[PDB]
Design an enzyme around this catalytic site. Sequence first.
Site, PDB file in Angstrom:
ATOM      1  N   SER A   1     -24.337 -18.715 -31.686  1.00 45.42           N
ATOM      2  CA  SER A   1     -23.454 -17.943 -32.605  1.00 45.42           C
ATOM      3  C   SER A   1     -22.227 -17.385 -31.868  1.00 45.42           C
ATOM      4  O   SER A   1     -21.613 -16.432 -32.387  1.00 45.42           O
ATOM      5  CB  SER A   1     -24.224 -16.846 -33.295  1.00 45.42           C
ATOM      6  OG  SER A   1     -23.704 -16.605 -34.594  1.00 45.42           O
TER       7      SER A   1
ATOM      8  N   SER B   1     -21.254 -16.089 -40.052  1.00 46.90           N
ATOM      9  CA  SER B   1     -21.399 -17.194 -39.118  1.00 46.90           C
ATOM     10  C   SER B   1     -22.100 -18.440 -39.678  1.00 46.90           C
ATOM     11  O   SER B   1     -22.055 -19.488 -39.013  1.00 46.90           O
ATOM     12  CB  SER B   1     -22.213 -16.765 -37.874  1.00 46.90           C
ATOM     13  OG  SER B   1     -21.623 -15.687 -37.181  1.00 46.90           O
TER      14      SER B   1
ATOM     15  N   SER C   1     -24.401 -12.759 -39.807  1.00 46.36           N
ATOM     16  CA  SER C   1     -24.321 -11.397 -40.231  1.00 46.36           C
ATOM     17  C   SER C   1     -22.923 -10.784 -40.075  1.00 46.36           C
ATOM     18  O   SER C   1     -22.064 -11.272 -39.319  1.00 46.36           O
ATOM     19  CB  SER C   1     -25.349 -10.549 -39.460  1.00 46.36           C
ATOM     20  OG  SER C   1     -25.063 -10.597 -38.067  1.00 46.36           O
TER      21      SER C   1
ATOM     22  N   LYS D   1     -20.042 -21.485 -39.381  1.00 47.06           N
ATOM     23  CA  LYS D   1     -19.967 -22.248 -38.195  1.00 47.06           C
ATOM     24  C   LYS D   1     -20.484 -23.666 -38.429  1.00 47.06           C
ATOM     25  O   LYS D   1     -19.992 -24.598 -37.753  1.00 47.06           O
ATOM     26  CB  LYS D   1     -20.667 -21.532 -37.028  1.00 47.06           C
ATOM     27  CG  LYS D   1     -19.802 -20.372 -36.470  1.00 47.06           C
ATOM     28  CD  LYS D   1     -20.527 -19.420 -35.534  1.00 47.06           C
ATOM     29  CE  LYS D   1     -19.823 -18.076 -35.468  1.00 47.06           C
ATOM     30  NZ  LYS D   1     -20.398 -17.224 -34.400  1.00 47.06           N
TER      31      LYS D   1
ATOM     32  N   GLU E   1     -12.694 -15.661 -36.219  1.00 44.96           N
ATOM     33  CA  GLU E   1     -13.625 -14.631 -35.687  1.00 44.96           C
ATOM     34  C   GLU E   1     -12.773 -13.526 -34.970  1.00 44.96           C
ATOM     35  O   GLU E   1     -11.841 -13.858 -34.209  1.00 44.96           O
ATOM     36  CB  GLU E   1     -14.612 -15.236 -34.691  1.00 44.96           C
ATOM     37  CG  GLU E   1     -15.579 -16.310 -35.274  1.00 44.96           C
ATOM     38  CD  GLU E   1     -16.642 -15.784 -36.230  1.00 44.96           C
ATOM     39  OE1 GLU E   1     -17.401 -16.598 -36.856  1.00 44.96           O
ATOM     40  OE2 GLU E   1     -16.745 -14.559 -36.358  1.00 44.96           O
TER      41      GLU E   1
HETATM   42  C1  LIG Z   1     -21.829 -14.277 -37.276  1.00 44.78           C
HETATM   43  O1  LIG Z   1     -22.500 -14.147 -38.281  1.00 44.78           O
HETATM   44  C2  LIG Z   1     -21.075 -13.316 -36.724  1.00 44.78           C
HETATM   45  C3  LIG Z   1     -21.515 -12.485 -35.760  1.00 44.78           C
HETATM   46  N1  LIG Z   1     -20.779 -11.407 -35.453  1.00 44.78           N
HETATM   47  C4  LIG Z   1     -21.051 -10.084 -35.992  1.00 44.78           C
HETATM   48  C5  LIG Z   1     -22.552  -9.756 -35.910  1.00 44.78           C
HETATM   49  O2  LIG Z   1     -23.018  -8.989 -36.777  1.00 44.78           O
HETATM   50  O3  LIG Z   1     -23.201 -10.279 -34.982  1.00 44.78           O
HETATM   51  C6  LIG Z   1     -20.203  -9.014 -35.295  1.00 44.78           C
HETATM   52  C7  LIG Z   1     -20.437  -7.636 -35.915  1.00 44.78           C
HETATM   53  C8  LIG Z   1     -20.461  -8.999 -33.789  1.00 44.78           C
HETATM   54  S1  LIG Z   1     -18.427  -9.434 -35.544  1.00 44.78           S
HETATM   55  O4  LIG Z   1     -18.212  -9.983 -37.028  1.00 44.78           O
HETATM   56  O5  LIG Z   1     -18.124 -10.547 -34.618  1.00 44.78           O
END
Ligand SMILES: *C(=O)/C=C/N[C@@H](C(=O)O)C(C)(C)S(=O)O
EC number: 3.5.2.6
Lengths: 260, 260
Positions: free
Chosen positions: A103, A43, A210, A46, A139
């Site tokens: 996020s 992310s 993440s 973004k 995403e």
């Molecule tokens: C941003 O970094 C992405 C977030 N999404 C993931 C996270 O670890 O929060 C997941 C596992 C939810 S997924 O890649 O959307």
Amino acid sequence: ADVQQKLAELERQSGGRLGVALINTADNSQILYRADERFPMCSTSKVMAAAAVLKQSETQKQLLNQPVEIKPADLVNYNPIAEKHVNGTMTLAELSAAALQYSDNTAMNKLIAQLGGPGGVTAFARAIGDETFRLDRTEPTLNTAIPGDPRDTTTPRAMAQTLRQLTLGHALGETQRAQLVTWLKGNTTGAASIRAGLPASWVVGDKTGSGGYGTTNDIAVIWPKDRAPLILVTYFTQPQPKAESRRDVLASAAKIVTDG
Amino acid sequence: ADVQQKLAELERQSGGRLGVALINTADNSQILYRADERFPMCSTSKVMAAAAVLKQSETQKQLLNQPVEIKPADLVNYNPIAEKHVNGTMTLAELSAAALQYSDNTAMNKLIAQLGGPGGVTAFARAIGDETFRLDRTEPTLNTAIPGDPRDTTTPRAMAQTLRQLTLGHALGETQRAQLVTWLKGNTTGAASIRAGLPASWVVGDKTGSGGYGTTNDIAVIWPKDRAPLILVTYFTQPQPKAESRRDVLASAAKIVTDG
Ligand SMILES: *C(=O)/C=C/N[C@@H](C(=O)O)C(C)(C)S(=O)O
Ligand SMILES: *C(=O)/C=C/N[C@@H](C(=O)O)C(C)(C)S(=O)O
């Protein structure tokens, strides 16, 4: 210096791969550790997408107020803002703030669709002189973080340089540069990451990320108490498919590089 | 049971004193730990002041637009927002956001002064049925957090109950209630505290605090994935005046009381 030994120690003790780039804008000095290796951005990407829409809004002057429909089918995996407007709409300003500060993944998808696909985000990277960044997926699959996969990667050095141009430099028009910094400074997700490693008095804007293989990222612009701003990129990934996040590694990395 | 023992184990290893109060609004159950002991609030007191100002705004109906002058002599010890407006002004809405989301201490002093002093904040607590809360001093001395001192203290149980009424009850009008929750949800300082202890899919609004004696506090309203919201207060203080803060302890506390 000792900075290198300390970063190496942190990395070993963590079991992962750590990537750090600090730019000190007082004198253009840098601190680098695996700064030219690729890491999954997750992310932290973004930032490039919201900046791309900012840039679009320099010629489409009402763009940030355009309503965008949120359908039930658009909802991805993490949608704390979007899901409150399903069968409703959100402006592109609202979506950018939701992507950046919360996020929200649905919001990121709308930014990506506005730019014509992941290609469009990459095209903007290239327009501001970033030849390393690549966005290839929407995403949530951009966050797979598979070792050896070049998709949706950049390097700490390239991302620090790009974040500097966007936030303190002239990649964006002045209003748009102010808007981005205002959104980053209002991030809700960063206190355990880069921020955790800095003196409480310093002011930070940053975007976390993440994903898979316990990928744990943060990119920040930092206004130290009584100093010229710093840019810091701390990227971290791990060998196991379902490793737990490690925001403390990032914090440790930020403490280490800013003690000097 | 299991949780009361775990909390004791956590406190046993922490080097300090831990206060917890959880209210699960699915069935009004509680989990309590030193929940009728006093703790110093530090910046978790900012919620009561912003909420008091919101209440005022129910009858003075453009109150939140009202400019307040910020002078150099107003600046305390930590004013990330207020310092950009010295020799200028901020609105009551802006002072509210700054105090909640950024923990700006000059902002809090302007909210206190809009309420007639620390006493007026306590008076508002009393008007909503909180008989425990006491605000006695302005920023920064409200955070001295000396053991045994009753100044600027509440109990975890009183604060859990109050927070529930402010954010899910009818202590405020509906718009004011929504405004508060929106401000709490946009906190920038909470990701290492209660939030760190909860699954990543759960949504949180919160206000952190810190001070002397390594006092480290967080109070939160939590919307878990697929459940009715919870209210959680975690307070923690230490025997040495210069102790380091322990947001990790709050995180662990949060995890213990939410595991099941
Ligand atoms: C941003 O970094 C992405 C977030 N999404 C993931 C996270 O670890 O929060 C997941 C596992 C939810 S997924 O890649 O959307
Ligand atoms: C809110 O909790 C205020 C925090 N203030 C103190 C802190 O520990 O952050 C100081 C030391 C900045 S000051 O005593 O207000």
